[PDB]
Write a protein that binds this ligand. Structure first.
Ligand SMILES: [F-]
Lengths: 251, 251
């Protein structure tokens, strides 16, 4: 029933300093408490962009489109803009390098019907796959908010999504971003154009996932107005600034 | 059948420059080639000590003694020498902190028969469980060499051990030590005793596991004579010095 939230506007300074606007949403699993700088934007739905690689990988694995994390998806020989895309990949490296063509191929093999069914089963954002089956998450109807991403991520973390436990374990392994002796970050980045509303030429960068600690899990979903195009850099820095500020990860 | 090894004594400087003796054994998976500073010690069998948490976790999970990585093993209320042991644990934290009492309880639930059967099925070291069912890896008959650890680890990495794929995925998750954008280290430390002619006990520290790269896996198993300085820290430092020397991981 009732969810505990804390609004801490002081995190806005991490965005303003970097000449940006954004939202950081955190969920403390043990305490069942959420923290955000912006309760309105925490609840504003956007294109997931490459954060859609998480349900996309889950569906592809569950349907047998992807056998395991080691299966090689050979480069189709077409030179694309990102050098790391122009080579063979497996699920781990396709996630790590956000290799859009690999995921577009998974989408096509999944198909509209199964893709739609699965997103409804995952209760994923607005569950709308309007547009091309191989690009709806980049330029179609799918919309998700930062709080809805956390909601989805919490199910994935707990192996509660309506796909096999194995599919969920493989995707969480593919999400592995950082680990040291204090914490483990399992997350995915996304960058796309604002199609939700009439905000032309602007870009929405995401960073969604979680921080595993010895005795707790801190889910996060963040998005910001990108000052440039298609890259990260700042996202992780702002999120880590918030996590350090909140005494979650050490300084 | 025949195993290719390269002996590189130059790594001895990483041992001597920390006033220690020991062995680093590496296995390049793609090239099927081994590298060591000491071919004799690479093959010398020792008590596995806490490196035994790897087969122990696999057996406990496969037999249902451990349901999953989140199951809480409550502290038995007995204050032990290591503060982190005097608290509740799950499989992740029990591995991370080498919580011996948690593993001793698993061992007792497993039993001699199933423990013996499983170690023979894993072709684990000398497969001898002589001594107490809950301490044989600390003060019993079990012996394993650095090359035999690599042999075991390679089967685990490939999900080739005669336990479920799930058990193997859970243990590899529990082994997660470090990850960044270049590599992933999944490993386990151990500290065993050694009988000396004087009547006391010398300590032999282990660090076994692997380094996952985009396109290769470097297995490692190291052991050294533990000095009266730091303790644990050195093992990782020496291994990382070797991995950096060998151009496996960046500086
Ligand atoms: F209790």
């Amino acid at each position: 029933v009732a969810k505990e939230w804390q609004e801490n506007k002081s995190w806005n300074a991490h965005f303003t300093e970097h000449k940006s606007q954004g939202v950081v949403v955190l969920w403390n699993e043990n305490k069942q408490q959420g923290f955000t700088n912006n309760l309105k934007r925490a609840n504003q739905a956007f294109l997931p962009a490459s954060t859609f690689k998480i349900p996309n990988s889950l569906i592809a694995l569950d349907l047998g489109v992807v056998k395991d994390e080691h299966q090689v998806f050979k480069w189709d020989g077409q030179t694309r803009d990102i050098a790391t895309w122009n080579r063979d990949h497996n699920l781990i490296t396709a996630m790590k390098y956000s290799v859009v063509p690999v995921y577009q191929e998974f989408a096509r093999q999944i198909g509209e019907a199964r893709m739609s069914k699965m997103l409804h089963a995952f209760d994923y954002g607005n569950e709308d796959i309007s547009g091309n089956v191989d690009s709806f998450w980049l330029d179609g109807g799918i919309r998700i908010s930062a709080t809805e991403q956390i909601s989805f991520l919490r199910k994935l973390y707990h192996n509660k999504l309506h796909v096999s436990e194995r599919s969920q374990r493989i995707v969480k392994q593919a999400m592995l971003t950082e680990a040291n002796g204090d914490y483990i970050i399992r997350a995915k980045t996304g960058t796309g154009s604002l199609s939700d509303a009439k905000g032309g030429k602007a870009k929405i960068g995401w960073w969604v996932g979680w921080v595993e600690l010895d005795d707790n899990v801190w889910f996060f979903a963040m998005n910001m107005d990108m000052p440039t195009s298609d890259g990260l850099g700042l996202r992780q820095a702002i999120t880590k600034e918030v996590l350090k500020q909140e005494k979650i990860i050490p300084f």
